[PDB]
């Protein structure tokens, strides 16, 4: 059996202009097994109604998902993606970064 760590990338659908509604995206990929936990936070709180792709994998058999929710950024407002997988020691949190 194999166990692949999930890879996490976060990003906005359009270059954010504070005060202007964007799309926060969180793309987990390359993990395995497919049981995973994903959330998208706002200042550390799990944002509510979020949509996400349907399970799907790649040639090497690793799965990936696209989590994303509409949001309106500011100078303040810290946003991050919290991933939890059998292969992780403790929930992994990657924060968004307008610059990154």
């Amino acid at each position: 059996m194999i166990q692949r760590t999930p890879k996490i990338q976060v990003y906005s659908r359009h270059p954010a202009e504070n005060g202007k509604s964007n799309f926060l995206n969180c793309y987990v990929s390359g993990f395995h097994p497919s049981d995973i936990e994903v959330d998208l936070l706002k200042n550390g709180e799990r944002i509510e109604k979020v949509e996400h792709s349907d399970l799907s994998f790649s040639k090497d058999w690793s799965f990936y998902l696209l989590y994303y929710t509409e949001f309106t950024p500011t100078e303040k407002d810290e946003y991050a993606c919290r991933v939890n997988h059998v292969t992780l020691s403790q929930p992994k949190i990657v924060k968004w970064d307008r610059d990154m």
């Binding site: 659908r13 270059p15 995206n25 349907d54 994998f57």
Partner: protein, 280 residues
Amino acid sequence: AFQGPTSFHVIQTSSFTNSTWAQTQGSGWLDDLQIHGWDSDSGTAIFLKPWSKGNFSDKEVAELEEIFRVYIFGFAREVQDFAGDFQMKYPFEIQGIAGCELHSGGAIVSFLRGALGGLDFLSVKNASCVPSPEGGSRAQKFCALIIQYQGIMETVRILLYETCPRYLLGVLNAGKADLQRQVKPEAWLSSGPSPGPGRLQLVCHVSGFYPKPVWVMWMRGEQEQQGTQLGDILPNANWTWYLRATLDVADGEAAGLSCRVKHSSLEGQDIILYWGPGSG
């Protein structure tokens, strides 16, 4: 070639928590573009586009359904039986991908490739179960113990060969509508995470573009730097993709650089963003 998908295939992730607890997740694709969803606990389907069905009839469509629907129910019902037999340790997960694809002129090759343990397990070639060495005792054990079901094999061939391109070319056309459409880009430079304090992280985004193929380089006049780290084409929930592309350089040398951005949807009218000053 003609711009868009070149294959359609289904996908199956059946996860086995234990002898009586199995959960299977299926879906239908065209490269990355998912056009078919399978609502599970019911047994139906989810067409995500008018052209999801493909020049196929509400009569044949609804026909495939039961095949799939029952296959799933059966596939699980079975695995749990031979679970001890093939000495499976719970929990395990088995994946499956199968479909056909077009190729450089007019020869349509299909495929059905299964996995277990996140590993290769079996491949169908010239209509016949082929035990990926990756499997072992069990792969042969199954590949063989399964050939002895001509009906199953019967269905497998038809769909896989007969029913597939008849459908493939079918939807591709049925939906050449927006499958060949063209969405131009976006773009916006930005600098962040400094390498060796005194150097700079030139970051050139590019979003919303469709089709997927795309060009992006941190050039300086006629020429490029190529030290340019082309990122991964991640995706947007809308059928378009995102794409970072960093550049590594020193304080001064930054200024005077730009991000060129070709694309099938721009027509020589590339995107150029020069590396301005101060205001990020």
